[PDB]
């Protein structure tokens, strides 16, 4: 192997004619940054690119993009050479013309439309022959280079000649450069992961299973809502490794008559055998084989057992691979994922904030946004929004701006200029516009998120800062010395204390410190399950908790359903909160085998909590949250105003002087209608502007600057006239008569001295 | 490639293996197994290897005779099942290995075998084990294929399996998933779905008389099926493959890697010990994937390609501890919520002092089981009946695990939130599984636990008064250890912390009418609880442990525990910031020198027992004693009878 054979990689950077390398890989062959490098593929391919250093790529890889993957004829993970050639040249002229199966509709000069800032400023190697994607006009063009002076390869110059005339040409045996990628699936990283180490071996290495003589995966079920893009990523992993793709939907074979739908199945069964390797898809497989409590008998019960016969009918491996797609993992019956038949299931849950922001910087690719467009504003703003919905709202904004482009030229004809296309621009009013008209579609899903609250937002509480890194931090980063000891850590924490004090905000702190998925559940939520319950959905809670560790659970309001029952219960009738807390003890007591999975329960009345909690293996630890001091007043008064512009004549010590029995929510309550009052202010100083030119209509322009209004101490004075306490004194008695009694120190100060 | 140095210079390295000439045999590597076939030898017939011995391997292969193959499944294919095992060894060995035998004595075999687990326990396999060494024939039903096909067609199906089993006597006939043929009479559905059971039933008694033929089925639930499948004479067997135990999980480990060349630092037992609910199909997945996350780890180095792999390169891999510990980490198990059956490890050792209560315990529940032939002599049955009452956190439990250990019984625990949970719409037929479980089980200890839950008394101290929960369930668990008196080898302990308000129905002969009192452990019980605490803990010499104990008053075991634990917490903390010194050092300056003299241990030192214990909580408030006081001795009837009854 000698060092100038190299393994393709996936890019960063998407230009079509740069590749990263690390810089000691460029030392061996002597390739010096900024070069000219000729690469040889497969099939007598070869291509032309430029060099850059980037030292997060490895020796042993090279990173690409994928035209110049599909130009070599290659796949990710493959083997290519990698040469150096000073031949390379510039250029005098250059003829290129553009692939008719992607011009049509669009008519004018594409020189100026796309190739003009395609080729400005960069010297982009050119191969005769080639083809080359532009992204404009909200779609792509392929073009394919026709000729060229030196010989076969050139680099393009700004003097360089570049001949564009002539009719389209006709697409070849060459895959389509549009289809779908990696590149184009965003917010699922980990389970593209998942799914590329599940595939690698029995696709890109396939015949080394006939000789290791080990069985590889074979069933592979993703679940997720509806529009999260099941379909986008299969369709991904089965181009992007050059596996054959057939797609069988549900309705389809459900739809037609009976042996017919039987005999689909055998069809494409046989069918992707015969061009192996290859990948199925069960698009909607739930409608096929539905749970077995439907009590649907005859046709209902053959297809199903069919399948399962057909799941069974693969006698040995044959580089295939099935893959199903639904939407809840229960909603199917028990008997598909046996053993061989659906070992592989995974969650593609609804994306974050920053998989939203990848979604949409996808989908926004081909159309020319505005410089006032702030797409994480948006991504900030759309919670509960799948990729479908996403992909919805930017063809919105696209559409608003074509009408409104439209509103001004009567183009009509038949086919728009490409100038005019790509002269639109889409600001951020269309986009604002679009999503207030959209809705979200998963609002009720569970949202396992890793939140962005930080130890530098909480106002004091040092010590409980402290307990929490001890308690959590430890046995997940460190659980090598733990087992050294031979004591096994306990799992469950229950904070109590006066409520809006800080308890979620520690929770959302520990889970983010750890960089652990943080998954939040309420009492109302659990009881809202419907009263008819449908007792699984707490059991499935747990579940998203095991297969997302490490994690945090974290359950908020216990008081709900977590009281004595009977001594501080209401609603005797029972059947509700009794269930739950039955369903949850029982989870928590099977949970304690995951030893990555952390259980965290609030509640704000610990005398009246249900004493089965606190037993060993459930909660079992209790840190109390007490009300913020003086020092700790001042840190959350100056945290609560970190962005608001407050006016240099304020004290703030005076403030937490003077808020005893102050929460911090009463705190943020002050500072929210000092700004509501600020708010008045600056209205009424901006009605100033209409007033005085109504009066005077030769009045001058006076905007200079928007009046800030900041907040001053008349306003903070103003807000303090009505500041409420939300706890009373007897509040604070009561869970001393607690905490102490939870303690076991008031009589135990350094009086143990022993040696 | 080279076979020869891959495979049979290590098979007959310094073994003086005799050889046979045309003989076959089977040497396991590469993840995989080849069968050798011994061609020639210089003397005569047989031979013995030596290093100075010729081996000639040069030819093609050669082609399978008659010969069974050896890769198939038997006894030492299949883990954890001993037990089940040699109940269906000593069921088919009479009718398989003598079949004639029972043309002569006239006394009709067994013939319905029903297997019953979580799926992918391994029925399917014990099946084909027990098929393939005793030599019978072996035609496997399917459920899903009979089922699929067209009515007629079905019907025919089994009538011509019977039949070939027949005509090839002795044979076994395997209905895998005989659930879907065969569901419960409560699905309502006529026509055909009445159609096949009654066929089957009618081919189960189609067998006119015995024709050395076994049918197993496999089912999922013993009440899944219809009541009418287990008539006389339809299927009278049945066997429960549960979820197996570490020694099982250790086992089938070591079945699945027989094949693997695991590393030297492969630590089998702690994988064992880590997967819980874990059933066989669970564990070869978790071997294949550790297998596969090596092969991608020697492919990643390697760009091997071509059509067949050297098998020298194959014989070379070698499966670490860190891949197991990905799949480990990458699976999760699929019989969590299975009522596991097994032997607890605890001892008395274990248990500090409640010496009177070991000794109790012996004389309640060692002697009626181990030593029966005595009892009866005085013609007195034994109670089997034991209820524990005290503070919480005391060794109730770890006194039931321990007297089901000792005594060589297998134990179930059963919680009262387990009970509860089994559906408000409650499936009633739940909680007699359980004690049908433990009939099964015998000799066998159930063990309820937080009786608190659901056995208070009805409206005088139970909330929730809208009922069909709590009562329910404790009418089902009288009724049910009403029904437990025949057996003669089943124990109930109970377990609840406020004896005051149980409920007086359990308390009655024939239930759990024996009370005994766990007490907080005195001074010497305290020293012996942190003695054991801190068995495996590397404790520092400078510790007393006796003051520990004198200090420690009104805290229960589990506050000792809580105490250790924080102590541990301290020093793992300190052992962190000391081994901070490592890269801070080298940090302020480079040319620092390797200090890696054996790492810290940072032993449990005064200072952290002292700082663990400024925050010591007492569980148990002094109101409880007295509370538990005032039960104990209106339930013992002792403080004024002592040593006052003197007759002759
Ligand atoms: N994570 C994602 N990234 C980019 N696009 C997505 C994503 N999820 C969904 N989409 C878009 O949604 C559209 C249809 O979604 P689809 O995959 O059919 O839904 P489902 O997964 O329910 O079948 C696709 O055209 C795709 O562009
Ligand atoms: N110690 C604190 N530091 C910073 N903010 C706080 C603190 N305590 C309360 N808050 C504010 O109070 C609001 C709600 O408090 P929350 O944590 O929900 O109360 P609880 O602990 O009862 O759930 C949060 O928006 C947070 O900004
Ligand atoms: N006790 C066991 N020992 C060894 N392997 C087992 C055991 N149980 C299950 N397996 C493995 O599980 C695989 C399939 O299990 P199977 O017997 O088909 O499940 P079921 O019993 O539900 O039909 C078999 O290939 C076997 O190797
Ligand atoms: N006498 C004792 N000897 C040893 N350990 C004990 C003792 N009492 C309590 N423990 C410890 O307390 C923990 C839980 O006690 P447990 O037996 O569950 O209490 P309960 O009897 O209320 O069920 C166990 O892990 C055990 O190690």
């Given at each position: 192997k000698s060092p100038n054979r190299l393994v393709v990689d996936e890019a960063i950077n998407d230009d079509n004619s740069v590749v990263s390398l690390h810089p000691a890989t460029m030392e061996k062959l002597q390739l010096f940054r900024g070069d000219t490098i000729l690469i040889k593929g497969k099939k007598r391919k070869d291509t032309v690119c430029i060099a850059l250093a980037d030292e997060t790529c490895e020796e042993p890889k090279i990173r690409m993009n994928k035209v110049v993957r599909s130009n070599l004829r290659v796949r990710l993970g493959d083997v290519i050479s990698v040469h150096q050639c000073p031949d390379v040249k510039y250029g005098k002229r250059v003829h290129i013309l553009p692939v008719d199966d992607?011009?049509?509709?669009?008519?004018?000069?594409?020189?100026?439309?796309?190739?003009?800032?395609?080729?400005?400023?960069?010297?982009?190697?050119?191969?005769?022959?080639?083809?080359?994607?532009?992204?404009?006009?909200?779609?792509?063009?392929?073009?394919?280079?026709?000729?060229?002076?030196?010989?076969?390869?050139?680099?393009?110059?700004?003097?360089?000649?570049?001949?564009?005339?002539?009719?389209?040409?006709?697409?070849?045996?060459?895959?389509?450069?549009?289809?779908?990628?990696?590149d184009d699936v965003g917010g699922v990283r980990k389970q593209m992961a998942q799914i590329r180490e599940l595939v690698e071996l029995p696709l890109r290495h396939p015949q080394l299973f006939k000789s290791?003589?080990?069985?590889?995966?074979?069933?592979?079920?993703?679940?997720?809502?509806?529009?999260?893009?099941?379909?986008?990523?299969?369709?991904?992993?089965?181009?992007?490794?050059?596996?054959?793709?057939?797609?069988?939907?549900?309705?389809?074979?459900?739809?037609?008559?009976?042996?017919?739908?039987?005999?689909?199945?055998?069809?494409?069964?046989?069918?992707?055998?015969?061009?192996?390797?290859?990948?199925?898809?069960?698009?909607?497989?739930?409608?096929?084989?539905?749970?077995?409590?439907?009590?649907?008998?005859?046709?209902?019960?053959?297809?199903?057992?069919?399948?399962?016969?057909?799941?069974?009918?693969?006698?040995?491996?044959?580089?295939?691979?099935?893959?199903?797609?639904?939407?809840?993992?229960?909603?199917?019956?028990?008997?598909?994922?046996?053993?061989?038949?659906?070992?592989?299931?995974?969650?593609?849950?609804?994306?974050?904030?920053?998989?939203?922001?990848?979604?949409?910087?996808?989908?926004?690719?081909?159309?020319?946004?505005?410089?006032?467009?702030?797409?994480?504003?948006?991504?900030?703003?759309?919670?509960?929004?799948?990729?479908?919905?996403?992909?919805?709202?930017?063809?919105?904004?696209?559409?608003?701006?074509?009408?409104?482009?439209?509103?001004?030229?009567?183009?009509?004809?038949?086919?728009?200029?490409?100038?005019?296309?790509?002269?639109?621009?889409?600001?951020?009013?269309?986009?604002?516009?679009?999503?207030?008209?959209?809705?979200?579609?998963?609002?009720?899903?569970?949202?396992?998120?890793?939140?962005?609250?930080?130890?530098?937002?909480?106002?004091?509480?040092?010590?409980?800062?402290?307990?929490?890194?001890?308690?959590?931090?430890?046995?997940?980063?460190?659980?090598?010395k733990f087992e050294k000891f031979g004591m096994s850590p306990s799992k469950g924490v229950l904070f109590y204390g006066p409520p809006g004090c800080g308890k979620t905000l520690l929770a959302k702190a520990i889970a983010n410190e750890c960089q652990a998925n943080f998954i939040s559940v309420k009492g109302p939520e659990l009881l809202t399950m419907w009263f008819g319950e449908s007792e699984a959905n707490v059991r499935e809670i747990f579940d998203k908790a095991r297969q997302s560790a490490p994690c945090v659970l974290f359950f908020d309001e216990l008081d709900s359903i977590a009281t004595q029952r009977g001594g501080g219960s209401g609603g005797d009738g029972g059947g509700a909160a009794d269930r739950v807390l039955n369903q949850l003890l029982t989870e928590m007591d099977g949970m304690n085998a995951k030893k990555t999975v952390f259980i965290i329960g609030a509640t704000n009345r610990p005398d009246i909590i249900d004493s089965a909690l606190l037993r060993p293996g459930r909660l079992d630890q209790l840190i109390y949250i007490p009300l913020p001091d003086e020092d700790s007043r001042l840190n959350i008064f100056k945290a609560a105003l970190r962005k608001s512009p407050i006016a240099k004549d304020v004290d703030i010590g005076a403030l937490a002087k003077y808020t005893q029995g102050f929460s911090g929510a009463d705190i943020t309550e002050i500072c929210q209608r000092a700004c509501k009052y600020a708010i008045r202010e600056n209205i009424e100083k901006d009605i100033e502007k209409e007033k005085r030119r109504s009066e005077n209509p030769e009045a001058m322009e006076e905007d200079g600057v928007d009046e800030v209004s900041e907040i001053k101490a008349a306003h903070f004075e103003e807000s303090m006239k009505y500041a409420r306490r939300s706890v009373s004194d007897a509040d604070i008695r009561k869970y001393q008569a607690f905490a102490q009694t939870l303690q076991q120190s008031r009589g135990f100060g350094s009086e143990f001295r022993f040696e």
């Open positions: 992607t011009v049509e509709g669009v008519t004018g000069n594409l020189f100026d439309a796309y190739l003009k800032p395609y080729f400005l400023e960069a010297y982009r190697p050119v191969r005769k022959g080639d083809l080359f994607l532009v992204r404009g006009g909200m779609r792509s063009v392929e073009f394919k280079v026709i000729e060229t002076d030196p010989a076969e390869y050139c680099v393009v110059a700004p003097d360089t000649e570049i001949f564009c005339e002539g009719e389209p040409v006709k697409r070849e045996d060459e895959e389509r450069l549009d289809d779908v990628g990696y290791i003589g080990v069985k590889p995966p074979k069933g592979i079920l993703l679940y997720g809502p509806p529009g999260s893009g099941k379909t986008l990523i299969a369709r991904a992993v089965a181009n992007e490794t050059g596996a054959f793709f057939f797609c069988i939907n549900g309705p389809e074979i459900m739809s037609k008559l009976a042996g017919e739908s039987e005999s689909n199945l055998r069809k494409a069964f046989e069918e992707a055998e015969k061009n192996a390797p290859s990948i199925i898809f069960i698009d909607e497989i739930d409608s096929i084989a539905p749970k077995r409590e439907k009590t649907n008998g005859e046709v209902e019960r053959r297809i199903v057992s069919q399948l399962l016969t057909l799941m069974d009918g693969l006698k040995s491996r044959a580089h295939v691979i099935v893959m199903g797609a639904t939407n809840r993992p229960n909603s199917i019956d028990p008997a598909l994922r046996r053993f061989g038949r659906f070992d592989r299931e995974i969650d593609i849950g609804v994306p974050d904030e920053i998989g939203r922001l990848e979604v949409l910087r996808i989908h926004t690719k081909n159309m020319k946004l505005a410089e006032d467009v702030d797409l994480e504003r948006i991504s900030k703003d759309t919670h509960g929004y799948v990729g479908a919905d996403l992909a919805a709202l930017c063809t919105e904004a696209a559409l608003q701006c074509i009408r409104e482009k439209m509103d001004v030229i009567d183009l009509e004809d038949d086919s728009i200029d490409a100038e005019i296309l790509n002269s639109m621009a889409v600001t951020n009013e269309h986009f604002h516009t679009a999503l207030g008209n959209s809705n979200p579609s998963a609002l009720r899903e569970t949202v396992v998120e890793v939140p962005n609250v930080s130890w530098n937002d909480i106002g004091g509480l040092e010590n409980v800062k402290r307990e929490l890194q001890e308690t959590v931090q430890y046995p997940v980063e460190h659980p090598e």
